[PDB]
Design a binder for this molecule. Structure first.
Ligand SMILES: [Mg+2]
Ligand SMILES: [Mg+2]
Ligand SMILES: [Mg+2]
Ligand SMILES: [Mg+2]
Lengths: 380, 404, 380, 404
């Protein structure tokens, strides 16, 4: 029996929305509802609408509560809706695993791997800046590195597809010339391109053999990935902004992508993302979960548990966190030579320092938007 | 027209309404509806906490860039909550634009395609006889198109506080937890065609006859049901089966010539693209408040038209009179218009939203007032603070959580 | 209430057919019905058949009049039919915007951009002629330039596909060697090729990264673009000669093109071309409206209004006009550093000098035809 | 044979006809029909102002190059007006070519596939009884195939100057504005199958039974209607739904085995390629005057044949006796021939076009005269100047502008 369903919002120094479920017998569960830029919309969805409906209820019935909130909302999917349902899910699996006196990955089918490969972020204003950044991050032991750097030439940013097409292969060329192959080489395209520009981009970087190119073109219309897929063999990843298998069912069934980047916080929690992962396996599509700063350590934990089990695991993103971010969330995960592992403690193995949290009130922050030279509002 | 104020109001007289009011430097005012039954405060937040402070520097004239700015600029893209917010803005912006133009909004959309807008009512009963009387009542009111339902024998609620035989009008029930209904598809399949039989027998054809299936059946069940009602020439059979998987409408279309409507719960063209392009439906029921306002909904309708799909906008109590006035401008213009749903508003609800549409012999027509032709009495709105109220859920005999 | 629906035909020095609608209260609207080479066919369609039917009628009912002329004609589509209906449409939106005391782009949803990128025409007898032409047009400030030049070796012209395949990539090579990338590089193929020749053409110019190749093969059968699309990543544009969404629905739905070149005068006016534009947006196809001399300034105006609004705007063609052409049409559009903007006056912001117009009677002029060495009549 | 003259004539006895006459250096004459009901002068222009001066140097022998020269050389390619012009040329050119050959035109096409050409008539009534008498009248005239219609009870025009019960023969009404008709699909669906029932009941089978749906229904409506008339074994059900989107015929074909005809309004193989290749129709109703003359129409028919689609050429008052004489040569040859429509011509109309086809017991046969076997009396044509006349439009109860 759930006795309390509480929502917390904190900023050290970025916003996190956290759900805490308490049962009658003292077991306590944590869940991430963080939705970058629309945080208070989810907080209200939970505090005002889902949490009171979680009170009479048996914690054991994870599936039923999921279905109850999924279908019972009537207006069915969506980023806010799912960020909430996933928070409820995450906290209930936290509770169940504690109840099993097990780490979460154990309830899922146990470890399919000894370690979880993560990738880091590297960036510059110039190529030279980028290569020194890659070299220090290689030094830190990551086996997979996502590389970006500036093009020669909400916050509104300026975008030129054309300047990017002509210039950006030059980066991967440099990375490969300095440092060999062996490391996995990654790149985020940030939805900036047309399908046929993405095809062109893919071809032009095939020589450097990317582990993937991610978010090539906006994917509301999943048919738009067909064009890129018929023209390049550079691996494709997508799915940060997805909240549903309905967002990616076509991309996977038509073998248009190699990595699905959906996340526990945003795509349905353990319950939903289990189903998405399993579906992708049939098509030899692998998991490339988003791991930015704006998913809180609660999700990282659960995602290290998920990643430890999934047969078809690909990579985990680990953008990382502030010592200021992490200390609100006492964690027990480890890192060694480019692999992470979840705790071996019951549940998610994660805590929430409420008193510390209360030191940090919500502060408004929005993601940038992109505009052409034109001023036409583009995909950031 | 620099936007100078962007305010959200939550009022409950006596069901919840979320209303956005945008005010311009020169003092033009526009209203937008952002009501999302059962999750209202999330949108209120989505508007109040993130979006309305972003609307403050902006030129109200630039409706498209604003729509795209919020649509894409929210990096997380679709969905009921997000789209409820965006639509409210867009609706308010088009209200302001027609006011600036000194024109009823329909005039800006392309002018009128028709002299008036056909609306349908609902009728119900616990028994077939009851439903026939309700039908006769609405027939004498001049309704040309009527949606009929009635109870499945054996299946009345055992819940003592159910608003029950009401509920078809106001399904969201004041309180904390959703009312739980028991569903049997099998008893529905055997019984419901008898309702349409009896209606057509007593009151022949001449009336357009509508029916809502409330998402309960699977494709092959809906297929059979459509077949079993072909003799009655339904104007439509509505929300047959869950539509997240648009391919699920295929088995239905293969097997019956009963007309198919869907789209109440949709917030985007991406929710219905496949259904339309594949000609799996005849009527698209998406709404201004939930499906992207004037801007987003003109796109859906125009796309639909290419496939000879007509509009059949959802119009329950939980869309505010602002969305209603707006829908009537859209309906009066839209070339591929089919029908408009018109659930009543109580007097209580309407005196908060002074309006100017009219009704005559089954057809509605909006203001000839500039903008939408709708107001929002903030002083009377302030009298009705938010009250929690939630949509039912359905469970099978199993206890299985099912589609409501 | 419309009181007059007048058609004018003038030649300074090229033919234009113009429609002028007057309402009871003095508001006046202008519309382009110019159809190159068949001008008097449209003039008659209007004066003899549509205009008298516009007299009793309410100017506000733009949609209804469109539908009334579209379906009521019984014989439904076609270049002449649509050139007429579009003229009626254009003039009625001119009237409506005046009635709103607004520039037209405002009624459409307002400006999505600060400027409208145009491309110019450049040509030669030789490559050197072409490059000096490009350099002077770059000097004039265009950011997009369509390049043609002669192959070494109605008016009937001679055509050799084979000489063109072997030679024409040599041009883009020269343009890129002299002047860098940055500028958008364009080319018109004039329907001259087979689908598989077009595929070959596309591949061979991929190295120069064209903004587009336009009208690769005749498109009555839209399936003929499939072959080019599976073999090249050079962007494709098409649609000058289209009058309908039915002409291009398959090309867009199957993601066979990147730019749709339909025009207000020829494809249904604001009402029709709004629908075509919107449909193309779903597939990330962008607008590349034809802007030749034989669309009159009335259309240019309205097209600058349309272009200013369309979310999915791509480019506007601006072949340009004679000082002799423009002075019949007092205009208020501007040009600055490769961008155009429509007036800020009510309506289209365009006028028609009738008295001047009457100085210039119609004169017969036809487009060339193309013939192989054979004499077989080919696609010009 | 150098073309020396190329003239357009517009005459009205008493409906409009546009006729092209081509004259050769040696003095062979050929006539072509270019009539486009309701927009006649546009084609007249398209011929007179641009095309006929282009036909002046040319060798009349080169029919194909001429066809392509105008087809492609008009940079703007298809369409009712353009194609009306091109067909008129082509028809005149093939008339000249058979004259040069001293042969009836059919002989040049491949010779006769049949001894004669089946034609269908129309019958109508305000009531079913009336229509049955009209049926009996045409049955005794020897017609083997008959198209039947009649009024939908309640829906007679309230317009005092309507030619009304006529109109099925000459729908284009002299004047300035189109006559406006009110349409109800729902009343059509409930009533019309009763007409076919009554016909088959009084006069059994033995007659081929045809019916024109006039573009009024949507795919699922047409689907239902086809189903509802299966018992009567219609020879065809015609123009079911607008066909700009050829995919719209799919829902129809999936649901009924009632035969489907379409193509009156088509000007090109591109208008019907998908419909044929997908086997969505049984009869292709394109015409010599509107669909590309002998040259373009042999292509359409041959393509159709691959799919077992037969020809069912439209033949109303608004195709001239030149197009009729031409159609009978085409029909007599074409292997996949289905039926020919034969609306009468008044005596007035025919004395302008001295002809030589014959009719015997429901079958027509063209001249055994060289060329088409048709003339054009220019002196009597000159007596009847052009009179404006326009096709109706239909509006729904709504005022909505709909498909006529
Ligand atoms: Mg990304
Ligand atoms: Mg419903
Ligand atoms: Mg071109
Ligand atoms: Mg017909």
């Amino acid at each position: 029996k759930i006795v309390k369903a509480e929502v917390f919002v904190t900023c050290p120094g970025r916003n996190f929305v956290t759900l805490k479920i308490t049962t009658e017998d003292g077991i306590t569960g944590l869940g991430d509802a963080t939705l970058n830029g629309r945080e208070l919309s989810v907080a209200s969805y939970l505090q005002d609408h889902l949490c009171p409906q979680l009170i009479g209820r048996d914690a054991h019935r994870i599936e039923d509560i999921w279905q109850f909130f999924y279908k019972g909302a009537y207006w069915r999917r969506g980023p806010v809706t799912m960020s909430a349902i996933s928070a409820v899910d995450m906290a209930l699996w936290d509770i169940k695993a504690k109840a099993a006196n097990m780490p979460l990955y154990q309830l899922l089918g146990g470890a399919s791997r000894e370690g979880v490969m993560v990738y880091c972020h590297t960036t510059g204003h110039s190529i030279d800046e980028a290569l020194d950044d890659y070299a220090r991050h290689q030094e830190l032991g990551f086996k997979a590195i996502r590389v970006q750097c500036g093009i020669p030439g909400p916050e509104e940013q300026l975008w030129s597809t054309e300047k990017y097409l002509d210039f950006m292969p030059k980066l991967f060329d440099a990375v490969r010339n300095k440092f060999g192959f062996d490391e996995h080489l990654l790149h985020d395209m940030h939805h900036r391109l047309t399908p046929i520009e993405a095809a062109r981009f893919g071809k032009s970087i095939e020589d450097y053999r990317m582990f993937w190119m991610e978010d090539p073109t906006p994917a509301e219309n999943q048919e738009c990935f067909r064009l890129i897929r018929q023209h390049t063999v550079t691996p494709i990843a997508v799915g940060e902004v997805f909240n549903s298998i309905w967002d990616c069912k076509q991309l996977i069934e038509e073998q248009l992508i190699d990595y699905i980047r959906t996340t526990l916080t945003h795509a349905g929690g353990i319950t939903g993302m289990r189903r998405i992962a399993d579906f992708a396996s049939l098509y030899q599509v692998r998991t490339g979960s988003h791991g930015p700063s704006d998913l809180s350590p609660v999700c990282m934990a659960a995602a290290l548990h998920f990643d430890l089990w999934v047969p078809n695991f690909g990579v985990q993103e680990y953008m990382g966190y502030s010592e200021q971010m992490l200390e609100v969330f006492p964690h027990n995960w480890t890192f060694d030579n480019g692999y992470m592992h979840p705790g071996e403690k019951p549940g998610l193995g994660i805590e929430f320092d409420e008193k510390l949290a209360a030191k940090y009130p919500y502060e408004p922050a929005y993601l940038p938007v992109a505009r052409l030279e034109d001023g036409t509002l583009w995909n950031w």
